[PDB]
Amino acid sequence: GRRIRIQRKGAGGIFKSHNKHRKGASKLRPLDYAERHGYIKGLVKDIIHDP
Amino acid sequence: VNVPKARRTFCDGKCRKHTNHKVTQYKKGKESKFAQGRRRYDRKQSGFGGQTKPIFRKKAKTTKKIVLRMECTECKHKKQLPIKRCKHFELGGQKKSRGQVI
Amino acid sequence: AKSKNHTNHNQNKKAHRNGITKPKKHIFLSMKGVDAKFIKNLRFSRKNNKRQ
Amino acid sequence: HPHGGGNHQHIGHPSTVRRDASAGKKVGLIAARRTGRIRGGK
RNA sequence: ACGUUUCCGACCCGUCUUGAAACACGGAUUGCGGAGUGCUUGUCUACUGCGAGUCAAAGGGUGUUAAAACCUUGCGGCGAA
RNA sequence: ACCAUCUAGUAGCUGGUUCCUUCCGAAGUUUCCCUCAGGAUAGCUGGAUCUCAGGCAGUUAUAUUCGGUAAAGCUAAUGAUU
RNA sequence: ACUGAUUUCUGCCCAGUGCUCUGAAUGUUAAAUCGUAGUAAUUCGAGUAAGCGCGGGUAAACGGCGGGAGUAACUAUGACUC
RNA sequence: GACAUUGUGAAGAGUCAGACUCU
RNA sequence: CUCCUCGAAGACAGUGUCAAGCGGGGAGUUUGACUGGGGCGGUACAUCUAUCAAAUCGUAACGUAGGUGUCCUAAGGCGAGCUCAGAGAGGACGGAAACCUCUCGUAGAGCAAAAGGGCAAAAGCUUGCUUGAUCUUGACUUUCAGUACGAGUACAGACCGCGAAAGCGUGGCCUAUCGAUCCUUUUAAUCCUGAUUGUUUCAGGUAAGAGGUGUCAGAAAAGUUACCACAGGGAUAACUGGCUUGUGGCAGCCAAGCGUCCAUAGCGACGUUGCUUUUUGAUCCUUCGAUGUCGGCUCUUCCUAUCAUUGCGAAGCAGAAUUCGCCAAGCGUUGGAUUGUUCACCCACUAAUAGGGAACGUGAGCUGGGUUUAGACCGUCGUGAGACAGGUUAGUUUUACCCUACUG
RNA sequence: GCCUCGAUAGCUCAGUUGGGAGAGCGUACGACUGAAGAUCGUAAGGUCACCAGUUCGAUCCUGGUUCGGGGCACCA
RNA sequence: GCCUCGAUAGCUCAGUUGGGAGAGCGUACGACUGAAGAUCGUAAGGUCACCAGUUCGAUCCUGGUUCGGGGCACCA
RNA sequence: UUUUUUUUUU
Ligand SMILES: C[C@@H]1C[C@@H]([C@H](O)CC2CC(=O)NC(=O)C2)C(=O)[C@@H](C)C1
């Protein structure tokens, strides 16, 4: 027989992520001296919708 | 089929006469792994290619020609006599009786 | 499509076309298949008859 | 597809497949410990 | 004599087939091309030379009408158990 | 999928297989084969001739044999049966 | 993966085949390893993992979901019984 | 599963006669 | 101050090699033959008996009735003795049947088994002793190609058994009861070889058996295709035609009876003789490099085995009416509901609502409802792909300008 | 039409190589009960479907016959 | 239409080489009871659907008529 | 532990 749809997804062609308008990856700050031995203050500039 | 365990029969060995033989049933020996056929077969089977010789799968016989191995009691010379095919075989069983109630 | 069809139709004609060959006349001379003891005695008898 | 074909639309074989099945065969309920509606807490 | 006319005879070829003029298939017409070969190995047969021998190989020597022809084998093939 | 090559792929199957006279002239049968549209095998057939110059014959006669079919029988066995 | 808006429902079966969950389980198990005999090739024996086998679960997994007799105060039928 | 990559220490158990085996 | 950038795991994982398990995810291949088409069924495939079989032998069919893959230390060998099946007549318990006795008894019994032969001081029954069911080679018969296996025959050489002996005995009274090459295994020789010399293992040889091929002269082998393909086949099926006519249809002969009485007005049983090819079968002759395969519509012509009409004869013919028959196809033999339907059934009219043929007339005349590809649904079947003269829905209908015929 | 399968008391079902015919309900008898039913104690019961054969003896083993039941019955 | 099957008492069913028409329900009467119901016993219920034939003898066997019940019946 | 019924009128 032929390859099934499940098998065809690994090649990452038409099955790649649609990320043209994504606003970035969701990640905390990198661990560093401030966070390990105190705290650092940041200002929430924006709340946005991530496609 | 009933066969006695002793038989006075011709001896091919040094005796060259009729002598007493102890009778037993022949049994195929253990196949050696250094017989030329086994060596060739193992080498042929090793590798890629799958099964290289036929495998028989259509057995039809339900009996075997029983071979009697008779050893002379004077020189230990051994004869092999096949008998006809039989389903049930026994060596030195109970002899038949005549005119007895069942 | 039956294809057994045995027959003996044209066989005597074929047999007779080149004639039916009768056995030769020397076939009774050979001493083949005769009793071994008789043959042995015949050899002994023939090996000793004085020629003259 | 392993389920395709037939004069009636049916799977024909159990839809629960073992974990170590091959790539083109691993379809359905993979390594399912149980099937059917969950009656109780799970 | 491939003209005409009379009398008698006269179904279209090739093919497979028990059986073809066949309501079996190929064939509209003409030209040209078109199919049991080569080689290796056997065997038998015919012819030729020599004959318990025969053929000699690769090679060598010579050959300028020099890829030929001519000469040349302790040894090799087949044969002689 | 398409392109070139292996590739003139193999075919127990279909089609074709090209001059003239003369002489001889069949088989569709036996056995074995995953055998039944095919082979090998014997038979039938042609050719080459060789050895000789009376023993043979799809025919008769004489002599001697073999057989259990037609007819006959069941008032002879077996089996029916008025 | 199956089913296929909404509404109302989704009964019984884990024996079979699957899938899955534990493993004390010497039941069965390869290579390697260890031991015995031998002068050596080698022979014999012990181990020997996962799997399988045993046990449990699971059907909105694949699927499956019976017969024969008698019987009621007209007959008929059969709530009922075997 | 075995062997190699694969090193350095402890505790227990078992073999031996300071080594080995495992955990 | 510290040559660990900061964390986690850490000699486990991962990686390399080998071993075992799973592995239609994938690859390759197979999926017997015969056969009154194939499939299903069966085995007529190796094989024995009686018949067919037509008086030597031989002789076919999926011809007829059966049998074979075993069984036997005796059911083999041999010596001796005896006679069987059955009948009659007798004898306490004893009866139709227990056991004893006498007469008769050609085999009417038995001999492992199928059938057929054979057998009476035996080939049967009882009993003694035994292992010739042993070792060796040739010849021959059967099948036959005059190959092989299997089976068997008659001898020869050895060693034996039984018998007083002559004699008999190489398995079963005879006709079936079975197996190549390669490989494995066993037995045999105080055997041969392992080629640098030897010894011992080990391995290989020569001879004889066993392990098995039942498709039985002997491949290692599951399905589906309606998505299908190729080489062919009229050697072979489905439609027409041909032979046949069982079946279908139609018509006669005799009269037992029916018909109030009366066999024949009208019928006619039990029997029996025919005809037809508008039924369905049987066959496989033609067609598989194709004869477009149901029905309806349309349109001709033909046959009658005559429904109506013309002319008549007979009645269980006193007349609407009705029945039988004769000469007779000139002329008619309709409108509709349901169904693709041919048929069927009903409504209505009618003089009547007769039956048939022409490639089951008629698709380069139509239509395409059915059948009859590919899509799809259901039920049953199948593990599945898929199957189903089971149901359902949708599914391309090509070309005449040639010859003839016909019309002008 | 082909291939199988079965036939056993009145009903429904076991059974052995071949030497027994069973089980439940039903039927009959006695008891308990005022009486029936439940319960207790007893008894009798089958065409082993029909035949022929095989062996010492067959419901059983083999063959045929009768009845019933199941499955197949497809291209076009 | 064809293969068939069956027709038995008011109703429902047995039955035979072919040599008797049985059983139940239903009907009438008797027993029982204070009287009934129920239960028992008796009496009972028939041209064996009709006709013809074959037989020494037919309900049964053969043929026909009526009544019904189960199946079979283009085509591609 | 188990323990169901008792025709009509009078
Ligand atoms: C005696 C018998 C046959 C033998 C073997 O299989 C036969 C051979 C035949 C041949 O030539 N080549 C093969 O590959 C097989 C075997 O081992 C057993 C089945 C038993």
Query: Residue with the nearest Cα to atom 6 of ligand 1?
Result: B56
Distance between Cα B61 and ligand 1 center (Å): 15
Strand partners, B21: B7, B72
Residues with CB under 6 A from ligand 1: B 53-54, 56
Burial B77-91 (b: 16+ CB within 10 A, else e): bbbeeeeeeeeebee
Q: List residues bridging with B68 in a β-sheet.
A: B25, B81
Buried b (16+ CB within 10 A) or exposed e, B10-19: ebeeeeeeeb
Nucleotide nearest to B34 (CA to C1'): I203
Mark the breaks in chain A: residue after which each occurs, C to N over 2.5 Å.
none
The residues pairing with B80 across neighbouring beta strands, listed in sequence order, are B69
d(CA B81, CA B87) in angstroms, rounded, equals 17
Question: Which positions in chain D touch A4 (Cβ < 8 Å)?
Answer: 1-2, 24, 27
Chains that touch C (3 or more CB pairs under 8 A): none
CA pair distance B38, A20, nearest whole angstrom: 68
Q: Which of residues 8-47 of A touch D (CB under 8 A)?
A: none
Q: Round to a whole number and report the distance in Å from the CA of D33 to the C1' of G58.
A: 7
Does the beta-carbon distance from D23 to A7 stay under 8 Å?
yes
CB atoms within 10 A of CB B73: 14
- Dump the DSSP string for A31-44: P-HHHHHS------
> In Å, how far is A15's CA from the nearest CA of chain D?
17
Contact B70/B19 with Cβ under 8 angstroms? no
CB B92 within 8 A of CB B35: no
Q: List all residues 6 or more positions away from B21 whose beta carbon is below 8 Å from its beta carbon.
A: B6, B7, B8, B9, B11, B70, B71, B72, B73, B79
Does the CA dihedral B3-B6-B8-B9 come out positive or negative?
positive
**For residue B57, which amino acid is it?**
R
Could you give phi then psi for residue C49, rounded to 5 degrees? -65, 120
Tell how far the Cα of B58 is from the centroid of ligand 1, in angstroms.
Answer: 12
Q: Dihedrals φ, ψ of B9, to 5°?
A: -145, 170
Chain A nearest-CA distance from D30, in A, is 13
Please tell me the distance in Å from A46's CA to the nearest CA on chain D: 40
What dihedral do alpha carbons D32, D38, D39, D42 form, nearest 10°? 80
Hits for CB < 7 Å against strand F across C residues 11-40:
11-20, 22, 25
Residue given tokens 């060959």 in the structure block: C21
